[PDB]
Amino acid sequence: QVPDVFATFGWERRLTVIHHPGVMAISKLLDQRTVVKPRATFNQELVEEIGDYDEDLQRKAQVALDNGLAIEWRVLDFIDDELPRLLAEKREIEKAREQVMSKAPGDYTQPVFDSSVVVPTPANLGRNYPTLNLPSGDPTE
Amino acid sequence: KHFFTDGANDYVTGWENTPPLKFPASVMKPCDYSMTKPIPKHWKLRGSGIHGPENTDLMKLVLWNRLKQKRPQREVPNINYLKDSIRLELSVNWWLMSCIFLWGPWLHWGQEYQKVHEQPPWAMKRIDGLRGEGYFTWFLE
Amino acid sequence: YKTENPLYKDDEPFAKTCHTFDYTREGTEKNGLGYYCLMGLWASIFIWDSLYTGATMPTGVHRYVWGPYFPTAWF
Amino acid sequence: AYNGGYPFHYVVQYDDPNYDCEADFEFEEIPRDEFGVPAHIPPELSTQIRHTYYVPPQYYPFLKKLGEDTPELKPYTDKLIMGDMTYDDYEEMFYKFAKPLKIYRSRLPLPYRTDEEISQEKYVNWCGRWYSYRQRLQGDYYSRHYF
Amino acid sequence: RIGGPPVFMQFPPPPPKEYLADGTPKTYPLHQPVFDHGYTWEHWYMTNAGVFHTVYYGEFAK
Amino acid sequence: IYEGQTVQESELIPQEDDWVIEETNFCLGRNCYVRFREEDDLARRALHQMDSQLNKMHTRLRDGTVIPYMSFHPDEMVDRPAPIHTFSEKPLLKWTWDETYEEAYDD
Amino acid sequence: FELNINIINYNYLGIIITVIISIYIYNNSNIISVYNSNLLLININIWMKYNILDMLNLNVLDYKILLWIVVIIISNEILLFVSFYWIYYHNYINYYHVNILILNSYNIVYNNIILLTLLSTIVNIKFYNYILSYYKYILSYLIYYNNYMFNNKIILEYKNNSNYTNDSVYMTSYFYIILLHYIHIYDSIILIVVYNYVNYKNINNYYININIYYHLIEVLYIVISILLYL
Amino acid sequence: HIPHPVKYVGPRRYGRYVYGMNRPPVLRQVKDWIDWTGWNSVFGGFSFQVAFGLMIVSGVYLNNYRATHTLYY
Amino acid sequence: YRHWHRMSEDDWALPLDSMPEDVKTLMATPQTERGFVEDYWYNRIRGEATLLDPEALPSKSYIALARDMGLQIVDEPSSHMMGLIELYEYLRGASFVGPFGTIENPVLVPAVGQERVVACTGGVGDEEHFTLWFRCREGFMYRCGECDQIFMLVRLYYEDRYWTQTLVRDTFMSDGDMFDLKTLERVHKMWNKDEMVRWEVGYWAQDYVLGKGVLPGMVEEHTRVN
């Protein structure tokens, strides 16, 4: 049985509605921007258009497309180094999805997978990526 | 558009009378209960019956109009909208071009002709002995 | 997957409700042929008045192949 | 469809942790969007790219439980588990399960009226109808007389 | 809006009543004089009191 | 044009043969200038004035319902004399229509 | 809950401003008038401060109320010019055959039209940036340069004109119509000197007001140019 | 307002600028730009000056040349 | 509602600088004793502590889950009060149109005070008459003298207070088991390690529990120039 809950929005001017408690839990979970992360999936046509604005991203985006990776943009800037982990991450996520989906109803046991390669997770919280927004070339050449 | 209108060009609050067409009717629909079938006599009025947030569609309209104000990315309009937004700006710019490249040349030509022939090239020459340039806009004579 | 560039998408339609906005039958969206005919007439009158100054003072001698009550005479 | 497509509020991210858009007057940093798209990728291109929410796999058992307890919610939870839920899919889920508040007339205290008075309701309605009947007829009578 | 000007507030109780030393209640200025003269007529007029009611308004000579 | 409410014949049939139109007096009473007490100070005279408002009066019918003081315009709805702040709560103009929605009912 | 409107109970600028107006009548020296005008400018600024502080009420109708007020003001400005055009054209039958030199139709009209068109383009770019939540520093200084040239040209024209206000009703109407336009150009300087970027953006009545007002001044000059120069 | 599609039918992207290589002729580029930003602004902006210029300069023939050759006295 | 202005930044979330510095007492304060800012952070700290512990969510009941996030379970009493609040708020800047009022179903006129001005416009079509204004006072079943429409005043009153969202929560929500600071620490170490802080509210909250400026980088975080 799922009880109904009051959901309120706004700080000084507050609007209240009835909502699903599970939906609200998902809503607040997706607000944890550091934990739940949006990831980008490319297609060949879009990758080509990227080159019109950033040649380096086009090459890195092509690598992600060729491996069918859903990748965060910040990670994409380091896809040259992160590729072996990203491929391992892709397999582990797929394994977890298969196990949970295939489990019988009422079976809420955690999936068995290698969390050390999945980011962000408690086992691996990610790397401190340095900013790449610095120039390397000499204007007079 | 420049001018603010509560009904259509309401950029101060962003209120919209109807939800986006993207949502399925099941998720959200315009607030229209004009077609409601007759109420059975054995049904009893529990709520006020007053038009307001007790109706599901109006509640969802109010909720969406507040929660739409934060979005991850821009909702890109089509080029027709973008043209209309700066219609006056673009047209004034072309008017400036017309003044420089159309009006200027023939106005300069008329003054040079006037120097030699005492009257603009688009005017009948006088025989009455009066001196001076005379009229400029011939069709208003 | 396949996508459409938002810049070249079509305008969204007005919602169909009890209160539906409809400009389709108004004929106010753009200037029509009648407007451009008025412009053509204005150019013609402007040119004509300058070219033929005596048009406003026409001749009074009347000569009709089939008399004055024949249609071609009237025009 | 409001404010020309510009949201009133949106998230901006910076690569340098110590960056301040108000203190610094440098010209190399490029701000990112909520999904992480760098600013020099125009929205008409980035909006076409499909972004999906990825939750840590430890949340899958919980998302499964939500779907089973509420079957109407299952298709949205499945999309989230499979990494196929975009922002639009989340919005559809959010507004689909929003319900309006209920007012119960049975809980309203009533103005005090004695039992004897409550039995005279039909009589008072009867008097009101006769007043209207008399009113409407008199209008015709007076209109004829004075005009 | 939380913290905004309330749409309704109850009146605070009136200040304490004042009595003279002997106990007589203190009176305050009142511009409703009792004119002195021998006339005692009382005129009454049926007055509109809305759309469905009237009031019998009386004017007293005093 | 307005010509009163429409009436059906069945609505005029009485439930008793002795029914006649109720003779309730709609004259609110005898009034004059509001007469204050010399003992009342400024605050208590204000209370006195607030208790003499004709627009707060009504006539109770035989079924317990009351027909209040009514006016064509809202100028007669504020306290007399007009207070500094009149319509703290927005007056409601009640419109009627035949539209209804299912959420309001329960089976 | 809260009241729909946060009432304003007391105000004292009205007395000060009204007294400042009276000082103009009761002056015994034109120097007092100059300093009195500064007081009027100061107190009007305070009134504008109150309007900005009213934003704290978060009232949706405040923007609409001020916008429609400006529309009414714009109409009054148009009708004021209409009266001058009315005055000019009433004596039309007495023009063009009196021994006075009317203005040339080649030099003044063209450069002024070009100059004022640039002013419109600058303001249009300001509006576009305001739409895009963006700013360009140089734009304001282009307006000042534009206004500097306009002042320099008009000053020379009046000084070098060989006919005077008392020569004919034609000359009076020419000078007066041109001055009335200048005063409205100067009023634009008064407004534009404070242009800045405010982070509450499209709920700021100043931006829409400036765009409307600058457009009005420029269109009025087109009517003036057709009436007098062409 | 009548909803209607975007009439622009020219190329949507020329590709990344690489020292101005593999780009259309200049005149074609000007035509594409006006198509992209709308011909309605061009016609509206130029309409007033074209009308005034034609009327004034037409007098060279209508008012000056014709009058000299057409004066019955 | 249409008469509200744009959402503020605070309408979405509050800045961490508004977090009470005495977190230990904040998590022990009863709900009736928590202010708006204190209540906001109590729910966010406790709500995010449960949501950021995936392994425990599936075994947690909806009642417990709703309590942790600070969401109120709906019941007929609370639903009734909230519904009338929203109706009152909506009518502040919206028209008042509904079914014709009768003795069985009087027109409901919400009010905070004992009185509210109302107008009767009769029925639909020909039955509509000119506006008849009257003062709707509590405790009387009002009957329009022209159309015989029945009106009644509904007061949003409760125990010397008028109905508000916070009042409804305090009256009906019941505080559960006292929040355990061990859960805060346990979740803190889960998502915050070796200079990576993916659970920042807990990082600040844990720092306040340990005093202030104990965890790495928090002294630099709390030092301000103006």
Ligand SMILES: CCCCCCCCCCCCCCCCCC(=O)OC[C@H](COP(=O)([O-])OCC(O)COP(=O)([O-])OC[C@@H](COC(=O)CCCCCCCCCCCCCCCCC)OC(=O)CCCCCCCCCCCCCCCCC)OC(=O)CCCCCCCCCCCCCCCCC
């Ligand atoms: C021959 C060559 C030479 C030619 C020279 C020409 C000289 C012209 C001089 C003009 C001077 C400048 C004036 C305008 C300055 C601002 C320009 C500007 O910003 O334009 C772009 C901009 C475009 O707006 P947008 O929203 O981006 O539109 C996008 C699209 O265009 C699409 O927009 P949309 O169609 O979707 O609609 C949205 C927009 C559309 O509106 C506009 O865009 C307006 C554009 C107007 C441009 C000017 C054209 C000329 C107008 C002539 C009007 C004549 C009136 C009748 C006179 C009768 C005389 C006997 O609506 C608004 O903005 C609403 C504005 C408020 C209107 C208030 C009107 C009040 C008066 C009503 C009539 C009163 C009389 C009633 C009589 C009957 C009684 C029973 O315009 C505005 O936003 C301006 C609005 C604010 C200023 C309004 C001023 C109103 C003055 C009323 C005077 C009433 C006097 C009545 C008594 C008179 C007799 C005694």
Ligand SMILES: CCCCCCCCCCCCCCCCCC(=O)OC[C@H](COP(=O)([O-])OCC(O)COP(=O)([O-])OC[C@@H](COC(=O)CCCCCCCCCCCCCCCCC)OC(=O)CCCCCCCCCCCCCCCCC)OC(=O)CCCCCCCCCCCCCCCCC
């Ligand atoms: C065998 C013998 C053979 C003989 C052969 C002879 C051959 C003869 C050939 C004759 C040819 C005649 C052709 C006639 C047919 C014409 C068909 C046609 O196309 O008509 C339509 C055509 C264009 O109309 P349309 O189709 O509606 O326009 C389309 C638009 O795109 C509509 O789109 P939209 O509405 O979106 O347009 C943009 C609109 C969008 O609107 C908005 O964005 C919304 C806001 C609008 C309201 C704006 C409020 C104010 C704005 C403030 C900003 C101002 C900035 C400037 C400030 C200046 C400061 C100084 O915004 C604007 O347009 C306005 C803003 C732009 C700047 C405005 C500048 C000021 C304008 C007012 C003053 C004008 C006078 C200036 C005078 C000079 C300076 C003093 O009309 C004309 O061109 C007029 C007809 C002219 C006929 C002249 C006839 C006489 C001359 C004959 C010459 C040849 C004779 C030679 C001798 C021959 C002897 C034999």
Ligand SMILES: CCCCCCCCCCCCCCCCCC(=O)OC[C@H](COP(=O)([O-])OCC(O)COP(=O)([O-])OC[C@@H](COC(=O)CCCCCCCCCCCCCCCCC)OC(=O)CCCCCCCCCCCCCCCCC)OC(=O)CCCCCCCCCCCCCCCCC
């Ligand atoms: C080998 C060198 C050859 C040089 C050839 C000459 C080139 C001179 C170009 C001058 C263009 C001035 C345009 C003024 C309008 C406002 C421009 C603007 O928006 O600036 C924004 C710009 C940055 O604004 P922002 O807000 O930071 O950024 C806004 C945007 O986001 C970002 O803005 P943005 O970056 O997109 O800005 C684009 C552009 C937008 O404007 C344009 O692109 C317009 C271009 C128009 C070309 C005009 C050429 C005039 C030449 C006439 C010569 C006639 C000779 C006659 C001989 C007669 C013989 C008998 O603005 C500029 O680039 C403005 C000029 C920047 C220079 C600032 C440093 C001081 C002046 C240095 C002058 C050096 C001259 C060297 C000459 C050497 C010759 C061998 O503003 C400034 O830099 C600050 C104010 C200063 C700018 C104006 C400086 C005027 C200098 C005039 C020099 C020519 C004098 C000729 C006298 C002839 C007497 C007979």
Ligand SMILES: CCCCCCCC/C=C/CCCCCCCC(=O)OC[C@H](COP(=O)(O)OCCN)OC(=O)CCCCCCC/C=C/CCCCCCCC
């Ligand atoms: C194989 C076929 C090739 C055909 C090539 C055809 C080439 C035709 C070139 C025509 C050039 C005409 C130039 C006219 C410039 C006049 C400039 C002028 O008068 O400047 C002065 C004036 C300001 O002077 P004031 O003293 O202030 O007086 C007026 C206000 N009081 O300034 C202006 O007019 C500025 C505007 C400049 C206009 C420039 C026009 C250029 C036209 C080029 C046309 C090219 C056509 C090419 C066709 C190619 C076909 C294959």
Ligand SMILES: CCCCCCCC/C=C/CCCCCCCC(=O)OC[C@H](COP(=O)(O)OCCN)OC(=O)CCCCCCC/C=C/CCCCCCCC
């Ligand atoms: C003699 C002819 C006339 C000249 C003499 C002086 C006349 C003075 C009359 C001035 C009338 C002013 C009416 C203003 C109405 C519109 C107000 C308005 O919208 O202001 C707000 C608007 C936007 O504010 P927000 O906070 O974003 O939003 C507001 C709330 N939503 O702000 C502004 O308009 C900013 C204005 C800044 C410039 C102020 C300059 C004041 C100039 C006064 C001139 C006095 C000169 C006196 C000379 C006397 C001797 C000749």
Ligand SMILES: CCCCCCCC/C=C/CCCCCCCC(=O)OC[C@H](COP(=O)(O)OCCN)OC(=O)CCCCCCC/C=C/CCCCCCCC
């Ligand atoms: C196509 C674009 C242009 C459209 C122009 C529209 C013009 C509209 C005019 C409206 C007012 C009409 C008034 C009736 C016409 C009277 C004309 C007339 O008699 O003129 C002479 C007469 C003087 O003669 P007497 O007094 O007998 O002796 C004088 C001896 N010194 O003059 C007048 O009285 C006329 C003065 C009024 C006309 C000028 C001012 C009013 C017009 C303002 C126009 C404003 C801009 C356009 C607004 C409309 C825009 C859509």
Ligand SMILES: CCCCCCCCCCCCCCCC(=O)OC[C@H](COP(=O)(O)O)OC(=O)CCCCCCCCCCCCCCC
């Ligand atoms: C207050 C003062 C205002 C200023 C003064 C205005 C006065 C005039 C105002 C008129 C209305 C202006 C707007 C018109 C809009 C328009 O064009 O409107 C265009 C409409 C057609 O509409 P659509 O094409 O949009 O459907 O045209 C018409 O309805 C009439 C004009 C068409 C041509 C008429 C032909 C006339 C014939 C005359 C005889 C010629 C003889 C030739 C012999 C060889």
Ligand SMILES: [Zn+2]
């Ligand atoms: Zn009634």
